[PDB]
Design an enzyme around this catalytic site. Structure first.
Site: not given
Length: 221
Positions: A80, A82
């Site tokens: 992901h 982030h």
């Protein structure tokens, strides 16, 4: 078989002959937090499922594994967008390490000011590195809108990433960018796709089995 680095900030634990779990102590919101990924020792080089928190830890991880396995890190799968997972992207790009991701993860990394991974992964993508088969799957929104899981079909090992909580986790952690309703459906999608799991590697904490997915569903109620 566990091996730590010079400062005890990075550890690798063997799951089987060619799969190891890497764990690095990083920092989130000022607190010390250990996080997990995988090191796949393939005939054609090392493939990481997730790199680390930032460039310093990513460099150390790469250097540790290249020296031990006597092969180069050639590819990384980013789960992901982030900072906690994309943080070492600058290191990957400058070293010529391929950074695989879905298109949405790449768009989010750019939006947040990070160098972009490849954006080559689809909803289901099957990769082959040496004799190592890797399947990536986007199950829907959960911890973030773009989170994916990774499956090793020759070992029935599931890398859950931050979508899956360890038994020790008693809360959902950082939910600032989470979709708590869809998160349950996404975990059910993983359980429906992978009915026979030997091991589940959570984003943080100890390795478990499908019980970690059931634990995450309970934390969501």
């Amino acid at each position: 078989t566990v091996i730590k680095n010079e400062t005890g900030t990075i550890s690798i634990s063997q799951l089987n002959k060619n799969v190891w779990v890497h764990t690095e102590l990083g920092s989130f919101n000022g607190e010390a937090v250990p996080s997990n990924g995988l090191v796949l020792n393939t005939s054609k080089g090392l493939v990481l499922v997730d790199s680390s928190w930032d460039d310093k830890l990513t460099k150390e991880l790469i250097e540790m594994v290249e020296k031990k396995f006597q092969k180069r890190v050639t590819d990384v799968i980013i789960t992901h967008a982030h900072a906690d997972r994309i943080g070492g992207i600058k290191t990957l790009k400058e070293r010529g390490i391929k950074a695989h991701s879905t298109a949405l993860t790449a768009e989010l990394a750019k939006k947040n000011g990070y160098e972009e991974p490849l954006g080559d992964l689809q909803t289901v993508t099957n990769l082959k590195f040496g004799n190592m088969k890797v399947e990536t799957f986007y199950p829907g929104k959960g911890h973030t809108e773009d989170n994916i899981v990774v499956w090793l079909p020759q070992y029935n090992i599931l890398v859950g990433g931050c979508l899956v909580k360890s038994t020790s986790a008693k809360d959902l952690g950082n939910v600032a960018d989470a979709y708590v309703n869809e998160w349950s459906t996404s975990i059910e999608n993983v359980l429906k796709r992978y009915r026979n799991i030997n091991a589940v590697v959570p984003g943080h904490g100890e390795v478990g089995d499908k019980g970690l997915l059931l634990h995450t569903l309970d934390l969501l109620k």
